[PDB]
Design an enzyme around this catalytic site. Structure first.
Site, mmCIF file in Angstrom:
data_model
loop_
_atom_site.group_PDB
_atom_site.id
_atom_site.type_symbol
_atom_site.label_atom_id
_atom_site.label_comp_id
_atom_site.label_asym_id
_atom_site.label_seq_id
_atom_site.Cartn_x
_atom_site.Cartn_y
_atom_site.Cartn_z
ATOM 1 N N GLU A 183 0.864 -1.173 0.000
ATOM 2 C CA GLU A 183 0.000 0.000 0.000
ATOM 3 C C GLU A 183 0.921 1.250 0.000
ATOM 4 O O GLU A 183 0.631 2.238 -0.672
ATOM 5 C CB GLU A 183 -0.866 0.023 1.261
ATOM 6 C CG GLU A 183 -1.910 1.171 1.362
ATOM 7 C CD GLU A 183 -1.347 2.471 2.020
ATOM 8 O OE1 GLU A 183 -0.264 2.422 2.636
ATOM 9 O OE2 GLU A 183 -2.010 3.536 1.908
ATOM 10 N N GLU A 184 2.029 1.178 0.741
ATOM 11 C CA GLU A 184 2.921 2.322 0.891
ATOM 12 C C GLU A 184 3.865 2.651 -0.275
ATOM 13 O O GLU A 184 4.307 1.779 -1.014
ATOM 14 C CB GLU A 184 3.795 2.163 2.141
ATOM 15 C CG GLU A 184 3.068 1.969 3.474
ATOM 16 C CD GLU A 184 2.463 3.231 4.052
ATOM 17 O OE1 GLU A 184 2.467 4.292 3.379
ATOM 18 O OE2 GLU A 184 1.967 3.160 5.220
ATOM 19 N N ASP A 205 -7.838 1.735 8.019
ATOM 20 C CA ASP A 205 -6.445 2.164 7.981
ATOM 21 C C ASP A 205 -6.244 3.290 9.001
ATOM 22 O O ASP A 205 -7.152 4.063 9.284
ATOM 23 C CB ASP A 205 -6.013 2.609 6.563
ATOM 24 C CG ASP A 205 -4.477 2.563 6.362
ATOM 25 O OD1 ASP A 205 -3.751 2.073 7.260
ATOM 26 O OD2 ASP A 205 -3.982 3.028 5.301
#
Ligand SMILES: [Zn+2]
Length: 323
Positions: free
Chosen positions: A163-164, A210
């Site tokens: 995701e990062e 998140d």
């Protein structure tokens, strides 16, 4: 031409009464989640790292031990990155694979890459170790009820990898696992043998967690096509509160507040949202003060808040699945 992909538009929840609500509140254990699901994830786990591998094994093992008939799949792929081609592995855990519709809960299990600084290691406790642990605790707490699924509707959990951004956010450096999985689901017929519907048509709603775990989160109602579900979360929070089932909680400091957010937050839901999937984005605004710092750690997590959100999420999932 079946209109089943339109069922999500009219789907209504089966609301739990007070007795059922007390049962869900009593059936989840924040201490068991903390020890058995969260702490093993509080390690460096950027894509390709040893920790990434350990995180994946932990997630699959915790799911495999449950009674419900979870089907696990590792979605592995290559992508270009600022550091050259790399491998990523999304984890998908599905109940009733051939079921036409699924309520989907998701988080990302990778941690943002940072070289060690002054002996500190980044572990992204709220980002997204807690979201991951909450999904595992939900699978565990509701196991007996979920086992009964063994409305052609079921449940799916996705733990996204990459995701990062490897550097700072850019369109091509971030959301590796979700951009990949969204395109893949969009091009996969569903249910098996279908002529013109994809797995994305089968996604009733994508609930993305998140940056959860800090004190006083405020989740805004981001999207009009999931607004009525945001409202259910508000109602659930309100009733659990009134029943005295939440801890250190006040309505004035409620998590689900009335108010939109004009802007766009980059996260794993983007690739899905942009392909027409309804999204309920449970990311708070503003972000935790520890966001993307070495202080996003265990010590700065708020236990009672995580416990309260576990109860709210579990009730929401049961009511959605009519369980
Ligand atoms: Zn992050």
């Amino acid at each position: 031409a079946s209109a089943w992909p339109e069922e999500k538009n009219y789907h209504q929840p089966a609301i739990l009464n007070s007795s059922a609500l007390r049962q869900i509140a009593e059936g989840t254990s924040i201490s068991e989640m903390w020890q058995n699901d969260l702490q093993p994830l509080l390690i460096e786990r950027y894509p390709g790292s040893p920790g990434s591998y350990a995180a994946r094994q932990h997630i699959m093992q915790r799911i495999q031990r449950l009674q419900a008939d979870w089907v696990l799949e590792i979605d592995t792929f290559l992508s270009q990155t600022p550091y050259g081609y790399r491998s990523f592995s999304n984890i998908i855990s599905t109940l009733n694979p051939t079921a036409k519709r699924h309520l989907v809960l998701a988080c990302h299990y990778d941690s943002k890459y940072f070289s060690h600084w002054n002996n500190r290691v980044f572990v992204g406790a709220t980002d997204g170790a807690v979201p991951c642990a909450m999904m595992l605790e939900l699978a565990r707490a509701l196991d007996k009820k979920l086992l009964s699924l063994k409305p052609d509707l079921s449940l799916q959990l996705i733990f996204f990898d990459g995701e990062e951004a490897f550097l700072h956010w850019s369109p091509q450096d971030s959301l590796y696992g979700s951009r990949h999985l969204a395109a893949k689901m969009a091009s996969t017929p569903h249910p098996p043998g279908a002529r013109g519907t994809s797995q994305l048509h089968g996604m009733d709603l994508l609930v993305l967690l998140d940056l959860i775990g800090a004190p006083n989160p405020t989740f805004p109602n981001f999207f009009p096509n999931s607004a009525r579900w945001f409202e259910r979360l508000q109602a659930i929070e309100h009733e659990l509160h009134e029943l005295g089932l939440l801890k250190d909680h006040s309505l004035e400091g409620r998590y689900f507040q009335n108010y939109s957010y004009g802007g766009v937050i980059q996260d794993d839901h983007i690739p899905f949202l942009r392909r027409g999937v309804p999204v309920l984005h449970l990311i708070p605004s503003p972000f935790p003060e520890v966001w993307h710092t070495m202080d996003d750690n265990e010590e700065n997590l708020d236990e009672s808040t995580i416990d309260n959100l576990n109860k709210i999420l579990q009730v929401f999932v049961l009511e959605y699945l009519h369980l």
